[PDB]
Ligand binder design. Structure first.
Ligand SMILES: Nc1ncnc2c1ncn2[C@@H]1O[C@H](COP(=O)(O)OP(=O)(O)NP(=O)(O)O)[C@@H](O)[C@H]1O
Ligand SMILES: Nc1ncnc2c1ncn2[C@@H]1O[C@H](COP(=O)(O)OP(=O)(O)NP(=O)(O)O)[C@@H](O)[C@H]1O
Ligand SMILES: O=C(C[C@H]1NCCC[C@@H]1O)Cn1cnc2cc(Br)c(Cl)cc2c1=O
Ligand SMILES: O=C(C[C@H]1NCCC[C@@H]1O)Cn1cnc2cc(Br)c(Cl)cc2c1=O
Ligand SMILES: [Mg+2]
Ligand SMILES: [Mg+2]
Ligand SMILES: [Mg+2]
Lengths: 480, 478
């Protein structure tokens, strides 16, 4: 059982919740964690979702090596270097993958010759390693992390930009539709974008309990900057040699940590049904040998019934644990529905179903279970999302002047503020908010994104900070 | 177009075929290779197949770190890759890249397992492994980075652990024989060949005729209790007494793709079994001038074939002749080509050519889906039955040591009665190597097959002249 309160010590709550639901096991190399089966199931669900979707776009999977040679790689303090095999030193040291541009792009130069070879659309599911300097957090910031990375190459900027946006929408679907986590689509500012690219888009999420925005995934319009460094050129139809226009995009096991932080409570995890490996757990109530044979047969019948409706059902008929130990176990683990079947319920042809998010109980006849559970699972899923969306919305404050900022940050909120979008000002702003945060004693404020969904901008509106005329509403806050 | 001949210059043939088919790209770090979509899709198929099967046995997936600290790993040496720095800074202890995950998984098992009610514990992971192999790299078969799965289970008893060893072994036979159409032989490794951290090692063995080598295809270990003793993986039984767990581990790699390539390939290139082919049917319109008539019909046909779950591509590229296209998709191993030209449009038909034998069929549009489903099953079956006959012809049953070198010189394996004395295997290895030079060349045990031929009473070991135990399969190896 979980005992730290989510709203008191958030850190300790998260650690307890992920350990006691058997999602992660700690490890001796710092910043690395073991992903146990209960967490791995959720990743498997989002993986299959995303993978299926990108295949409909013609993206194909591949696997490129985990090693890149020193001279091809040449961010530096993060790179893990292999220097030896056994007691022997490598003639030239080798780096483990931190990203795969330097591994993929020279091959792309070789394979692309003509318009007939475009678009080239590849992905890979793999792990990367970055010797993170920041405080590690299981899922959210780890030194080895699982991800996919998508890398595409096209004839025109328009087609590449369209795929950038399609992928971004798929990531809104991974968070929103699978994980029931609300995200904001935006553009990264010039200071925050991937420097090898032209434009970076993001989906951004929010952790209410510590006030932090967090980048949930990313999708880059790379332009022709990398085609030029790597000599990725093709002949069009009229015999002419052109640079490719490229995209890349990635999303990681960070997504699980965001889910856990978003929906969990004081009793531990709450898993949204769309990604729960066990949607419904059936618990026989077995005590002083009362009806034990008939309770178990009904449990099996109920399961076959529910899986005809494609519900994911487990019977926990394990002998060596009490029914109450099972209630608690599958609560902490975040199973959406718990169906209890004891002697009394057996006599009435009913079952008692407890939903995990609100703790509400229902009495339901065997004949209405399938359609009633499906309805409840759709209500849990929608309800998790809507409550998280309202919290997201409660957490962002529309403002006009710099004077409003530090108070908004102290309330653990984000700010939506009009901004001139000048690179020099973000640097000034972050150095400044850091100063005032140190003095007040918890971190600098930065841009998260410029949201796609722009509210109206009145003609004389000025930038909240410089005073120059503003261009767009930009979302700022503290961040992971 | 492939030009090295598969029987005559096998090594060149293999390199050409995997490169020209667009399966692999060569890379500047030795023994590492890019797996392009054409190959990777086959990996995805076998992965999905094996993963669904082990999920039915209650095995669950997990991801353990790729890094293991020196003190945990050294609880082989020359193969370990060591990370000593991050950026310009030295780590306090050097970290190994996971050559295999025993030393990463078993301390966690020792934490998680306390009572009989925690058992069985059954995990698998899909990951890559790194070993700095001393032997010559070969794409797929022996690489310095490879993809695999590793399964590791723990049981209250030896008998349940063994049951699982054999079930996993059966799944490996299905990975090879049902998905890749590659015949394999189940058997027990000898004492010198088994995994030394285990009690008994079971295997599926395969055979490459063109160089006469056996190759271990996959492996499944009854580990017994020795790791449980080493890592202190113990549980209280039902009476409160502490007991050691009984463990298994098993694994299979991208080696399997290379075996499939070599098994079914011919002088024109790859031949991919339909169950795993990325494209099962390529539609090649006879075009040189486009008007929409041919291409329109080819789209309608693709839609109809996809309804029947056929993986179809239309090669509508403008600048290639149909002949160039036939060759291209033949080198890639597409099992069925569907040709659609003006004459075909005029007669409501399509001409389908099989990659494995070259036979052509004329088929009405209406009959396409069922006839192609039938062909695919004919191709998959015929690829297997042919490879199985070649495997059979590659093994000579013998009685005496004098029949050995001639059988090895015929690029054949030997099946021989053996006393199974461990000293004798070391001797046979040395004496066959030394005769290979004065004429690696060593002949070693591949396995002791579950399928034993008859052993008449009094049959003698082919090497020691002592009483023979079982027939053992021997040859040159990867
Ligand atoms: N250490 C990490 N652990 C887990 N997820 C990560 C980690 N670093 C990045 N991610 C996620 O992976 C996505 C793509 O990686 P990338 O764009 O390289 O991130 P980044 O530039 O390193 N962001 P940041 O580390 O905050 O500077 C990010 O948008 C994050 O959602
Ligand atoms: N370098 C490699 N590349 C690809 N597959 C491999 C490689 N080494 C082993 N395998 C395969 O993985 C299976 C399990 O690995 P493992 O049991 O560790 O083999 P091993 O003991 O290293 N065999 P070997 O190295 O030939 O003596 C082996 O039976 C092979 O089928
Ligand atoms: O990794 C990226 C840019 C994109 N690469 C493809 C997947 C999606 C991803 O956003 C940014 N990035 C982040 N961290 C890095 C760390 C190191 Br070390 C290196 Cl060499 C390079 C990088 C690096 O390029
Ligand atoms: O890797 C194995 C034993 C088993 N591990 C799980 C998958 C199936 C496999 O047969 C044998 N082996 C092979 N090569 C190794 C190389 C090194 Br380096 C190390 Cl440390 C250890 C090993 C090592 O243990
Ligand atoms: Mg970073
Ligand atoms: Mg950043
Ligand atoms: Mg060996």
């Amino acid at each position: 059982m979980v005992t730290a309160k989510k709203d008191e010590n958030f850190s300790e709550w998260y650690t307890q919740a992920i350990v006691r639901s058997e999602m992660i096991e700690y490890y001796d190399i710092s910043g690395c964690y073991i992903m146990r089966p209960w967490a791995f199931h959720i990743w498997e669900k989002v993986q299959r979702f995303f993978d299926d979707e990108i295949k409909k776009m013609g993206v194909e999977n591949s696997y490129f090596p985990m090693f890149v040679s020193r001279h091809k790689l040449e961010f530096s303090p993060e790179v893990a270097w292999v220097t030896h095999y056994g007691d022997s030193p490598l003639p030239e040291k080798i780096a483990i993958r931190p990203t795969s541009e330097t591994i993929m792009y020279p091959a792309y130069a070789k394979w692309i010759r003509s318009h007939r070879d475009l678009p080239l659309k590849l992905n890979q599911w793999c792990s990367v390693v970055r010797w993170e300097f920041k405080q590690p957090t299981p899922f959210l910031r780890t030194r080895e992390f699982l991800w996919q990375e998508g890398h595409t190459a096209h004839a025109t900027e328009e087609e590449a930009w369209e795929l950038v946006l399609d992928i971004l929408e798929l990531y809104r679907r991974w968070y929103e539709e699978c994980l029931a986590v609300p995200v904001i689509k935006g553009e990264k500012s010039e200071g925050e974008k991937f420097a090898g690219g032209k434009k970076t888009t993001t989906v951004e999420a929010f952790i209410p309990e510590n006030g932090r925005g967090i980048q949930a995934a990313t999708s880059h319009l790379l332009g022709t900057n990398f085609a030029k460094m790597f000599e990725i050129e093709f002949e069009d139809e009229e015999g002419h040699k052109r640079l490719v226009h490229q995209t890349s995009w990635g999303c990681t096991t960070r997504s699980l940590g965001v889910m856990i932080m978003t929906h969990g409570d004081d009793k531990g995890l709450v898993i949204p049904p769309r990604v729960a490996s066990v949607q419904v757990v059936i618990i026989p109530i077995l005590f002083k040998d009362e009806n034990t044979g008939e309770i178990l047969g009904k449990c099996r019948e109920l399961k076959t019934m529910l899986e005809k409706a494609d519900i994911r059902v487990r019977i926990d008929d394990r002998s060596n644990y009490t029914p109450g130990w099972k209630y608690n176990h599958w609560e902490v683990k975040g199973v959406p529905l718990r169906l209890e079947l004891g002697p009394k319920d057996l006599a009435k042809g009913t079952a008692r179903v407890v939903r995990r998010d609100t703790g509400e109980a229902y009495q339901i006849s065997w004949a209405d279970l399938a359609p009633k559970l499906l309805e409840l699972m759709e209500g849990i899923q929608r309800s998790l999302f809507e409550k998280a969306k309202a919290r997201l919305h409660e957490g962002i404050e529309k403002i006009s002047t710099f004077d409003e900022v530090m108070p908004a940050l102290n309330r653990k909120h984000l700010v939506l503020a009009p901004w001139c979008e000048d690179p020099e000002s973000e640097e000034q702003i972050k150095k400044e908010t850091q100063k005032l945060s140190e003095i007040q004693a918890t971190g600098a404020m930065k841009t998260l994104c410029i949201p796609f969904d722009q509210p109206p901008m009145p003609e004389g509106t000025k930038c909240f900070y410089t005073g120059k005329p503003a261009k767009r509403w930009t979302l700022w806050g503290r961040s992971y």
